[PDB]
């Protein structure tokens, strides 16, 4: 099956809220809440991918970020490796730059059922910060 490397950014403000977008109805993991991110392209690193993806999707440049979690998940029709970067400093103000819904969500109120199942251990670990 398809095998993908995905870089996503956990965008956390000083009020313990995370900037979360909602995936399109015709996408893989349609209508799910998500950390902004996307496919790591040939010739770019995981760190470069999370910067580019957040610039494209929500209009911020992450800086001084860290790898929060790396995990693999087997979906029904594809295998993905997810790189979860914790982003606590950035240039810009995140918004729905690609026309997608985005909003700040309290960390304590996140419901892992709203996200792709691959995010389950990450959402749990975030709540223990
Ligand atoms: N962006 C994102 N994707 C996730 C998360 N959890 C998770 O399992 N995924 C999966 C869903 C997709 O199968 C894949 C993400 O790919 P994507 O749809 O963001 O790819 P992309 O932005 O590069 O796509 P495109 O705009 O180039 O069309 O990883 C998450 O928190 N954020
Ligand atoms: O890989 C993340 C990890 O590396 C450190 C340095 O030890 O940060 C470096 O890499 C980050 C991601 O590219 C950069 O944002 C950062 O500026 C750079 O120092 C750690 O801070 C981080 O845990
Ligand atoms: Mn994208
Ligand atoms: Mn992409
Ligand atoms: Mn994406």
TrEMBL record:
UniProt-listed Enzyme Commission number(s): 3.6.1.55
Residue ranges occupied by any Nudix hydrolase domain in the UniProt entry: 1-129
Swiss-Prot/TrEMBL keywords: DNA damage, DNA repair, DNA replication, Hydrolase, Magnesium, Metal-binding, Mutator protein
Binding residue positions for Mg(2+): 37, 57
UniProt superkingdom: Bacteria
One Pfam family of this chain: NUDIX
SUPFAM superfamilies (UniProt xref): Nudix
GO molecular function: 8-oxo-7,8-dihydrodeoxyguanosine triphosphate pyrophosphatase activity; 8-oxo-7,8-dihydroguanosine triphosphate pyrophosphatase activity; 8-oxo-dGDP phosphatase activity; 8-oxo-GDP phosphatase activity; metal ion binding
Catalysed reaction equations from the record: 8-oxo-GTP + H2O = 8-oxo-GMP + diphosphate + H(+); 8-oxo-dGTP + H2O = 8-oxo-dGMP + diphosphate + H(+)
Keyword Hydrolase included in the entry's annotation: yes
InterPro entries: Mutator_MutT (IPR003561), MutT-like (IPR047127), Nudix_hydrolase (IPR020476), NUDIX_hydrolase-like_dom_sf (IPR015797), NUDIX_hydrolase_CS (IPR020084), NUDIX_hydrolase_dom (IPR000086)
Gene Ontology biological process terms, A to Z: DNA repair; DNA replication
Cofactor field: Mg(2+)
Name of protein: 8-oxo-dGTP diphosphatase
Organism per entry: Escherichia coli
């Amino acid at each position: 099956m398809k095998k993908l490397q995905i870089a996503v950014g956990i965008i956390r403000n000083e009020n313990n809220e995370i900037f979360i977008t909602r995936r399109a109805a015709d996408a893989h993991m349609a209508n799910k809440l998500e950390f902004p991110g996307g496919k790591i392209e040939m010739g770019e690193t995981p760190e470069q991918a999370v910067v580019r993806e957040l610039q494209e999707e929500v209009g911020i440049t992450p800086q001084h970020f860290s790898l929060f979690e790396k995990l693999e998940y087997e979906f029904p029709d594809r295998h993905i490796t997810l790189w979860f970067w914790l982003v606590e400093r950035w240039e810009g103000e995140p918004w729905g730059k690609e026309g997608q819904p985005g909003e700040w969500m309290s960390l304590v109120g996140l419901n892992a059922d709203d996200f792709p199942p691959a995010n389950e251990p990450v959402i749990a670990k975030l709540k223990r910060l």
